[PDB]
Amino acid sequence: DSDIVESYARAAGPVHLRVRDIMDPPPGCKVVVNAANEGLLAGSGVCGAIFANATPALAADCRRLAPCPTGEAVATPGHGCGYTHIIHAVAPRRPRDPAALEEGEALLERAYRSIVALAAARRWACVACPLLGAGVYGWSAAESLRAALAATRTEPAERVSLHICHPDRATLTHASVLVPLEHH
Numbered sequence: 001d002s003d004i005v006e007s008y009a010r011a012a013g014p015v016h017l018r019v020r021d022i023m024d025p026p027p028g029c030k031v032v033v034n035a036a037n038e039g040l041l042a043g044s045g046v047c048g049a050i051f052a053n054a055t056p057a058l059a060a061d062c063r064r065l066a067p068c069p070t071g072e073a074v075a076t077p078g079h080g081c082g083y084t085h086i087i088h089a090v091a092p093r094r095p096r097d098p099a100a101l102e103e104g105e106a107l108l109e110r111a112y113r114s115i116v117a118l119a120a121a122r123r124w125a126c127v128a129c130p131l132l133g134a135g136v137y138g139w140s141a142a143e144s145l146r147a148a149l150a151a152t153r154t155e156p157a158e159r160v161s162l163h164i165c166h167p168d169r170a171t172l173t174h175a176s177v178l179v180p181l182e183h184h
């Protein structure tokens with residue numbers, strides 16, 4: 001646990017900020033989150049890395065399940081990507097000029113809430129998760145972390161610990177300063 005920048009206490013469960021590749025499972029995380037699109041298609045970034053390491057049956061399962069509405073999440077088997085299951089969660093694209101912005105912050109928080117409720121229903125205690133929406137969907141790491149730390153305030157039926165993984169130390173340490181700074 002030397003990769004942990006900070007650990008936050010939240011109703012859902014502890015949220016750990018971890019310097020590591022999403023494809024390098026944290027100890028005890030058998031379930032990973034895909035930062036997915038509504039069509040559940042392979043993309044770049046985290047989605048690319050998960051599909052890159054999986055069988056064709058994953059695309060087949062997604063064909064059966066698509067679309068996953070923005071703000072929602074849906075599970076599939078992992079198909080050899082290194083995890084037993086994948087939670088495909090769909091972040092909104094960041095609205096470029098409000099008021100859609102405040103609407104989109106709620107939808108980003110909802111995506112994280114949807115991950116937690118899903119994991120709780122499957123009795124998955126730990127989940128490895130990227131910073132939803134912080135890649136091509138335009139959010140910053142701090143915006144995505146702030147959303148995760150808000151979403152986890154909603155108490156779930158069973159505790160779920162989010163291990164948030166990003167391979168760049170500076171991105172996470174920076175985000176860990178900006179989150180409290182907003183409230184300062």
Ligand SMILES: Nc1ncnc2c1ncn2[C@@H]1O[C@H](COP(=O)(O)OP(=O)(O)OC[C@H]2O[C@@H](O)[C@H](O)[C@@H]2O)[C@@H](O)[C@H]1O
Nearest residue numbers: 022035037043044045046047130131132133134135136137
């Ligand atoms: N291997 C990786 N491991 C951990 N974090 C990663 C990795 N690759 C990217 N990240 C980071 O995770 C966050 C999410 O970035 P994206 O992967 O681009 O996901 P998102 O912004 O939500 O956009 C989703 C869209 O992009 C496609 O990958 C996906 O199919 C969908 O269309 C960003 O912080 C990104 O830098």
